[PDB]
Amino acid sequence: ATKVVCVLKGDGPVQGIINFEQKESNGPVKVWGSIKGLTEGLHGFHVHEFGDNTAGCTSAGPHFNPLHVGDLGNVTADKDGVADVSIEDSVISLSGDHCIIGRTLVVHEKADSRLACGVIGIAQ
Amino acid sequence: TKVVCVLKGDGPVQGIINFEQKESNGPVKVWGSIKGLTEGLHGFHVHEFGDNTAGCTSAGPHFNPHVGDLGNVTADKDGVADVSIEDSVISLSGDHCIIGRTLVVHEKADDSRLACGVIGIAQ
């Protein structure tokens, strides 16, 4: 897989679609998309260990950090509550030890609770 | 290796399905429950894409690197289907790996897509 996608949903208004692409094995991963329903300002953005939505975002487990690897920084919401995301990350991967396929992406209430999340799935 | 899938759709169909594989060349155990179904048989399939941007529609075709065909599940008179399957064609590693793909339960028996979810790594 060179492309994966995540649909973020939660108990409140936060929702979005985030794409990840890694055209070269072990290469940088491009992350992009949009999230709406957020309070204006900065929000933590993290891959968590488990792609387990049995208890909503509360079952996603800890930040992904194999022996954080899953820490993607903050996303920024504007006055309309929309965060446009465009990130490059060379620590996460779509293969190998830092593989994020089948894990959970979470957008958090605070800047670095879990507002929305989804399982990271194969898109291509 | 353990994975889980939460099935959700536009109507009453919902469930939690677990998969476990003890060794890479071994059978995958599949177990869980689905509720909200019409009594009787329902197709049960892994689809190619873990893409839920258009609900179950964006999941694409049956996974077939079909490998994804898990047979039918059977719902009782209360609409509950118990899932207890062992499958040696799907895998949680290698080329038949289903992690990050979509599980779908279908309206019709195998001879619409009622609910689906992306298959994720579990504790």
Curated annotation (Swiss-Prot), chain A:
Entry EC no(s): 1.15.1.1
Phenotype upon changing C57S: Enhances formation of fibrillar aggregates in the absence of bound zinc
Effect noted on mutating H68S: Destabilization of dimer and loss of zinc binding
PTM entry text: The ditryptophan cross-link at Trp-32 is responsible for the non-disulfide-linked homodimerization. Such modification might only occur in extreme conditions and additional experimental evidence is required. Palmitoylation helps nuclear targeting and decreases catalytic activity.
Keywords linked to the UniProt accession: Acetylation, Amyotrophic lateral sclerosis, Antioxidant, Copper, Cytoplasm, Disease variant, Disulfide bond, Lipoprotein, Metal-binding, Neurodegeneration, Nucleus, Oxidoreductase, Palmitate, Phosphoprotein, Ubl conjugation, Zinc
Entry similarity comment: Belongs to the Cu-Zn superoxide dismutase family.
Record's protein name: Superoxide dismutase [Cu-Zn]
Upper taxonomic lineage: Eukaryota, Metazoa, Chordata, Craniata, Vertebrata
Protein's gene: SOD1
